UniProtKB/Swiss-Prot annotation, chain A:
Component of the small ribosomal subunit (SSU). Mature yeast ribosomes consist of a small (40S) and a large (60S) subunit. The 40S small subunit contains 1 molecule of ribosomal RNA (18S rRNA) and 33 different proteins (encoded by 57 genes). The large 60S subunit contains 3 rRNA molecules (25S, 5.8S and 5S rRNA) and 46 different proteins (encoded by 81 genes). eS1 interacts directly with uS11 and eS26, which form part of the mRNA exit tunnel. Keywords: Acetylation, Cytoplasm, Isopeptide bond, Phosphoprotein, Ribonucleoprotein, Ribosomal protein, Ubl conjugation. Present with 92400 molecules/cell in log phase SD medium. PROSITE patterns: RIBOSOMAL_S3AE. PANTHER family: 40S RIBOSOMAL PROTEIN S3A. Component of the ribosome, a large ribonucleoprotein complex responsible for the synthesis of proteins in the cell. The small ribosomal subunit (SSU) binds messenger RNAs (mRNAs) and translates the encoded message by selecting cognate aminoacyl-transfer RNA (tRNA) molecules. The large subunit (LSU) contains the ribosomal catalytic site termed the peptidyl transferase center (PTC), which catalyzes the formation of peptide bonds, thereby polymerizing the amino acids delivered by tRNAs into a polypeptide chain. This is Small ribosomal subunit protein eS1A. GO terms for molecular function: structural constituent of ribosome. Residues 1-17 have a biased composition (Basic residues).
Swiss-Prot record, chain B:
NCBIfam families: ksgA. Specifically dimethylates two adjacent adenosines in the loop of a conserved hairpin near the 3'-end of 18S rRNA in the 40S particle. One of its GO terms (molecular function) is 18S rRNA (adenine(1779)-N(6)/adenine(1780)-N(6))-dimethyltransferase activity. This is Dimethyladenosine transferase. Its EC number is 2.1.1.183. PANTHER family: DIMETHYLADENOSINE TRANSFERASE, DIMETHYLADENOSINE TRANSFERASE-RELATED. It comes from Saccharomyces cerevisiae (strain ATCC 204508 / S288c) (Baker's yeast). The keyword Nucleotide-binding does not apply. S-adenosyl-L-methionine binds at residues 2, 4, 29, 50, 78, 93. One of its GO terms (cellular component) is cytoplasm. Transmembrane segments: none annotated.
From Swiss-Prot, chain D:
It comes from Saccharomyces cerevisiae (strain ATCC 204508 / S288c) (Baker's yeast). This is Small ribosomal subunit protein uS11A. Gene3D superfamilies: Ribosomal protein S11. Pfam families: Ribosomal_S11. The gene is RPS14A. Keywords: Acetylation, Cytoplasm, Nucleus, Ribonucleoprotein, Ribosomal protein, Ribosome biogenesis, rRNA processing.
Swiss-Prot record, chain E:
Signal peptide: none annotated. The chain holds residues 93 to 273 of 274 of the full protein. The gene is PNO1. It comes from Saccharomyces cerevisiae (strain ATCC 204508 / S288c). GO terms for cellular component: 90S preribosome; cytoplasm; nucleolus; nucleus. It is found in: Cytoplasm; Nucleus, Nucleolus. GO terms for biological process: endonucleolytic cleavage in ITS1 to separate SSU-rRNA from 5.8S rRNA and LSU-rRNA from tricistronic rRNA transcript (SSU-rRNA, 5.8S rRNA, LSU-rRNA); endonucleolytic cleavage to generate mature 5'-end of SSU-rRNA from (SSU-rRNA, 5.8S rRNA, LSU-rRNA); proteasome assembly; ribosomal small subunit export from nucleus; ribosome assembly. Required for small ribosomal subunit (SSU) synthesis. Has a role in the processing of early nucleolar and late cytoplasmic pre-RNA species. Recruits DIM1 to nucleolar pre-RNAs. Indirectly required for cleavage at the A2 site of the 20S pre-rRNA, forming 18S rRNA, and at A1 and A2 sites of other pre-rRNAs. GO terms for molecular function: rRNA primary transcript binding; unfolded protein binding. Residues 103-155 form the KH domain. Keywords: Cytoplasm, Nucleus, Phosphoprotein, Ribosome biogenesis, RNA-binding. The lineage of its organism: Eukaryota, Fungi, Dikarya, Ascomycota, Saccharomycotina. Its main location: cytoplasm. This is Pre-rRNA-processing protein PNO1. Component of the small ribosomal subunit, ribosomal RNA processing complex (SSU RRP complex). Interacts with NOB1. Belongs to the PNO1 family.
Length: 240, 283, 130, 127, 181
RNA sequence: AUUUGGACAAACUUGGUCAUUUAGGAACUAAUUCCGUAGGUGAACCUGCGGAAGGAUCAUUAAA
RNA sequence: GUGAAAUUCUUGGAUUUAUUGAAGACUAACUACUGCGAAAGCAUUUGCCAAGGACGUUUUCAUUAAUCAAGAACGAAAGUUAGGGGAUCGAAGAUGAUCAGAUACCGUCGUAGUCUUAACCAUAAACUAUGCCGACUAGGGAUCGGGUGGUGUUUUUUUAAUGACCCACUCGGCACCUUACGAGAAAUCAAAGUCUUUGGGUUCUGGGGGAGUAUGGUCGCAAGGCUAAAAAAGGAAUUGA
């Protein structure tokens, strides 16, 4: 409120003149995803200025962006999916980016939440063969049979703990066998939850088996050559 | 509002008021005017303060034309804010929410009245009548038993009130101690606050609260600054060094362990004398 | 008035279009029906208590013509209006002027002091009569 | 082709924050307030405030040159309500009528799994 | 240049959706010219604005509000009323957000705020000219801004434990001033 | 630093100067209920905590 | 920020945005006319430590059983003593606003406390407002756990688990609903029922409201001990006379 009956306070005793010109001093910078994705060219970010190339570099390295797999791969089935990345390297208005984390959308989680079934969650803590420390959150629901005459579909805690152990084994094995980009490629066509489904096929009929969330916890040392490799040199223009 | 339904208890009020014919009597909330005309018949002068224009209008219309309208005067406005004269007796029946600040005002009035009579809740009256060794003792109870001495008269009924309230009432009498004992009211109030943060913990722990330690640290510190002395360097907190000081005061007095609902005014004064003695001042 | 605790017959669009568009039509129709009933019952009592013949009272959109005129049908409304009822005199709009019922108008400054006195006397006695 | 923005819309109970940021939420493009929009203290939670705010931030967004935008509403969250407001719906309608190319709408409200005690009490918080 | 929106539906709401789907699209596809599809595979409804067939900025948004109101549990005619107007706004809130209660206390409270056979709910709706949806804890109130504000204050009183007689007193009071305006 | 004598001399007292403002009579003009616990100083009771109903249930909702 | 403002703090840019980190609490939704526990009480993962229910058993022994003053254990919250941190919330207290209206009576800070350790403290609408142990007396659906039989589907196959749904039965529970053949003040009750007036074993208890009165029947409770005043129309009145 800035009305004439808005009672004055200390506040705007001394203010300034809007002369900063932020959208002229700023500079657009196109970020770009690793080669594991279809539409790597997604999203441009604004660097505050250009006199500090150091400031540009540290800001773009501190950038943590997020996107969805739907807009990432053109298949809008994965609208509920969402990942976070971070620009790790820059090159002349083009910025190398790398994966950071994953989650779903809250409305998807809410819709998957129902009243006559049990939700199981597995929260494993692992480090890749790429030495990326990671924490994985996965979820599934106790569906009912086609012959089910019962209103509910509830199972024993013995089944719960057994299936939990089975899941966590699957995650630990697959991640420790995998690397970072390998984990992303596994993560894309939902094949891991299908594997867990076929594993847990004998214990109980389940549904909505999904890895909920990915948490980067530690990242190893820097390798710009590896980043350039996983993304996919430059001369000048003779200014005189 | 509420209207009385007992001229008999009005007669009891004036009978216990025990009128001197040389009295100027101040009345807050004179009401429909029964007490007003009784005191107008009994005393020399009656000043009535009112905050209700409609009640003051019906009162002046009821009392216009009597011989004692020359002795009756009606002042308007918030009596807690406006100036008040001298009076010998004060009788009133106000809502008690403004009566308790009126209680503090009539205690701290210069040249206080000789006797006064008031109407309170039953709970409020018993809280005022709270003695040591009793459950209703509070800071207000200790204040009123310090500055004055009280006497129960009677109790009132809500079914005898119109309209009947929820909380019961009673009628009490206040007599200010003449002469007033020279207690610094600031010091007495500060110590009463500190001792009655919890009435059933130890007074040791009541000081062991952090904020009282900080307050008395600052108080003793500016006291030492005004007396122009320097304190020995504390390795931890100044709160802790003056806390050790007050602990020495407590183990000197042998009373800080006690329960705050039982200690009397004599232990109160010996403790405050120990504190003024060691240089601790609550203001 | 009093509210109703049954389900509303109309939706939000219906009440809002109703508001987006006689004390009440219900009181109007009630007055109408009891009027026709009173007409018929007065008619029945006139039948039962009449020595002389009384027929039925009456029988109980589109452009419609009113046969019976309560006026000669060729007189202007301004003609039937009385001149008094289309202008009377009142007190003047400027307080420095005083307009009387006989139509005389006086400025408070072109007067003499004795006249102001007797005029104040007249206004005082008339207001005291009031 | 198009360039996208981040339309974070806080739908407070007595306020409306319409803040747009760039990629990674770092380059803060614009930020506005309901009361600042309509200089009243009752109307800091006004749908009209939401309308004028959305129009103005759409003007700034077309000024900087961002055409398409993903919009993320956020309620109060916390131990308070986590449902966004009619001011939020009004702002959404007003920006859709402003015509910036809406890519995707989100409701990212901070929901406690297991929180602490609210400021209400044993009988209730309000009224 | 098309532009589209997707809206989920729960199956308990999908059953009357399937039951009365026939009268849903005729207000929108004819008066708003909005392409409809419904993936029962995904339990969602898709609405696409065509650029040449439709040049109307807020219509896709208005249809989104319409389907949101219906799926939240409001009736077809009032959701259509939301389509007719543009100043109809919804507020939902929870009993645990206002004052947390437990079990049979929550049960008695739901019975209280419902009243005998929704009579009190009808009284509120008629007074505030609002529409109410009573879920387990989610309470949804559709209507004008100050209307749902007044209804919110009233239902907060009901949740906190107000007797229905004094509720009716305040109800005819607020209905008196709202009828006078 | 200190020192002589003048003049100006603020300021104060004591008053003198003139100036400017600031009731009697005499004219004119105008006309929700309950337990247990803890506490209470703007206390016709209230707060805090833990409990009870002996407090009024409308609508959808098996599957494609 | 409230019904409304207002105290509050924001160029050393709050709120917000993003990136975190720390603190201390909490363990939602799932969640049930579910489960467990003597109750009070008990929802994050995993492990350990023990324990316990029920079901199954052609294992055991052979009255070892019930009711129980004394005595023993537990016992919500708060409260008390000695420590810890102490995010949030928060008896007290402090204030802003006291505005019309409370139909829409707070806002902010903040001590104790909130949690923990070691102790006490033994009250709760601690209710199924309903002594225990035992036996008999309607059905009908549930569910949970255990077991059995067979049926199917899902399941899987020299591997370390063969589990999931169906129906029939079985125990043992949370219960649900209909009714009485019974009883009753009626509500109701499968007990608050077990043939007119009546005996299965056992601990305890007893012979409405307000009002008004007499009190040795009892317990609390006080004060002060120098201090002074003696009739009006001698109206109203922008209104009158």
């Amino acid at each position: 409120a800035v009305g004439k009956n808005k009672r004055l306070s200390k506040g705007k005793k001394g203010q300034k003149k809007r002369v900063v010109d932020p959208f002229t001093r700023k500079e657009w910078f196109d970020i770009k995803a690793p080669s594991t994705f279809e539409n790597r060219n997604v999203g441009k970010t604004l660097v505050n200025k250009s006199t500090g190339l150091k400031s540009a570099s540290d800001a773009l390295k501190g950038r943590v962006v997020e996107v969805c797999l739907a807009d990432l791969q053109g298949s809008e089935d994965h609208s509920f999916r969402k990942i976070k990345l971070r620009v790790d390297e820059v090159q002349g208005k083009n910025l190398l980016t790398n994966f950071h984390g994953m989650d779903f959308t809250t409305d998807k989680l809410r819709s998957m939440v129902r009243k006559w079934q049990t939700l199981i969650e597995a929260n494993v803590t692992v480090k890749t063969s790429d030495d990326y420390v990671l924490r994985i959150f996965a979820i599934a629901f106790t569906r009912k049979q086609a012959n089910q005459v019962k209103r509910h579909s509830y199972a024993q805690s013995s089944h719960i703990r057994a299936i939990r152990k089975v899941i966590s084994e699957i995650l630990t094995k697959e991640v420790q066998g995998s690397t970072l980009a390998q984990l992303t490629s596994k993560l894309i066509p939902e094949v891991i939850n299908k594997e867990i489904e076929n594993a847990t096929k004998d214990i109980f009929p389940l549904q909505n088996i999904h890895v909920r969330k990915v948490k980067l916890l530690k990242q190893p040392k820097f390798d710009v050559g590896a980043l350039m490799a996983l993304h996919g040199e430059e001369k000048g223009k003779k200014v005189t | 509002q509420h209207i009385l339904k007992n001229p008999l208890v009005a007669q009891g009020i004036v009978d216990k008021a025990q009128i001197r014919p040389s009295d100027v009597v101040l009345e807050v909330g004179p009401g429909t005017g029964n007490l007003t005309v009784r005191i107008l018949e009994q005393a020399k002068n009656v000043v009535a303060v009112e905050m209700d224009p409609r009640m003051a209008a019906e009162l002046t219309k009821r009392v216009r034309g009597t011989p004692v309208e020359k002795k009756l005067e009606i002042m308007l406005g918030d009596f807690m804010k406006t100036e008040l004269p001298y009076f010998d007796i004060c009788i009133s029946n106000t809502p008690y929410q403004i009566s308790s600040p009126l209680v503090f005002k009539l205690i701290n009035q210069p040249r206080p009245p000789r006797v006064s009579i008031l109407m309170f809740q039953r709970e409020f009256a018993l809280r005022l009548l709270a003695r040591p060794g009793d459950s209703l003792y509070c800071r207000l109870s200790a204040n009123v038993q310090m500055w004055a001495n009280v006497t129960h008269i009677m109790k009132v009924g809500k079914n005898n009130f119109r309209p009947p309230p929820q909380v019961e009432s009673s009628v009490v009498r206040l007599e200010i101690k003449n002469p007033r004992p020279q207690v610094d009211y600031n010091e007495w109030d500060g110590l009463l606050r500190i001792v009655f943060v919890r009435k059933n913990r130890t007074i040791s722990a009541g000081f062991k609260s952090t904020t009282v330690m900080d307050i008395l640290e600052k108080n003793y510190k500016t006291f030492l600054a005004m007396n122009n002395e320097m304190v020995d360097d504390t390795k931890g907190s100044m709160h802790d060094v003056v806390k050790e000081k007050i602990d020495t005061v407590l183990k000197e007095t042998d009373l800080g362990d006690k329960r705050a609902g039982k200690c009397d005014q004599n232990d109160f004064l010996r403790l405050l004398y120990a504190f003024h003695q060691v240089g601790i001042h609550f203001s | 008035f009093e509210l109703s605790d049954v389900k509303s017959s109309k939706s939000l669009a219906e009440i809002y279009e109703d508001d987006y568009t006689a004390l009440s039509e219900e009181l109007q129709k009630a007055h109408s029906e009891i009027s026709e009933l009173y007409a018929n019952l007065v008619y029945k009592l006139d039948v039962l208590s009449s020595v002389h013949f009384v027929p039925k009272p009456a029988s109980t959109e589109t452009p419609t013509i009113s046969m019976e005129d309560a006026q000669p049908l060729y007189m202007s409304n301004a003609s039937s209006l009385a001149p008094q009822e289309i202008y009377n005199v009142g007190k003047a709009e400027k307080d420095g002027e005083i307009r009387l019922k006989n139509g005389v108008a006086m400025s408070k400054e072109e007067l003499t002091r004795e006249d102001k006195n007797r005029l104040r006397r007249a206004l005082k006695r008339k207001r005291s009569k009031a | 082709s198009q360039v996208f923005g981040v339309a974070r819309i806080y739908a407070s109970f007595n306020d409306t924050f319409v803040h747009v940021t760039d990629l990674s939420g770092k380059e803060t493009i614009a930020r506005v307030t309901g009361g600042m929009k309509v200089k009243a203290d009752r109307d800091e939670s006004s749908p009209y405030a939401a309308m004028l705010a959305a129009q103005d931030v759409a003007a700034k967004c077309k000024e900087v040159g961002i055409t398409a935008v993903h919009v993320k509403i956020r309620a109060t969250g916390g131990t308070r309500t986590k449902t966004p407001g009619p001011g939020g719906q009004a702002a959404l309608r007003a920006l859709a009528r402003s015509g910036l190319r809406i890519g995707r709408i989100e409701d990212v409200t901070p929901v406690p799994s297991d929180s602490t005690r609210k400021k209400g009490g044993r009988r209730g918080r309000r009224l | 240049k098309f532009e589209s929106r997707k809206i989920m539906v729960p199956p308990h709401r999908m059953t009357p959706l399937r039951n009365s789907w026939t009268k849903i699209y005729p207000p929108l596809v004819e008066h708003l010219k909005l392409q409809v599809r419904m993936n029962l595979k995904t339990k969602s409804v898709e609405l696409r604005t065509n650029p040449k067939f439709t040049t109307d900025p807020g219509a896709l948004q208005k249809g989104a509000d319409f389907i949101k109101a219906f799926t939240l549990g409001f009736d077809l005619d009032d959701s259509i009323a939301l389509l007719r107007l543009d100043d109809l706004y919804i507020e939902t809130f929870e009993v645990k957000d206002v004052k947390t209660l437990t079990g049979d206390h929550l049960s008695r409270a739901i019975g209280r705020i419902a009243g005998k056979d929704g009579k009190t709910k009808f009284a509120i709706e008629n007074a505030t000219r609002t529409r109410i949806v009573l879920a387990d804890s989610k309470i949804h109130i559709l209507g004008g801004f100050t209307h749902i504000r007044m209804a919110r204050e009233s239902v907060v009183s009901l949740i906190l434990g107000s007797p229905p007689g004094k509720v009716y007193g305040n109800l005819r009071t607020v209905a008196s001033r709202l009828k006078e305006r």
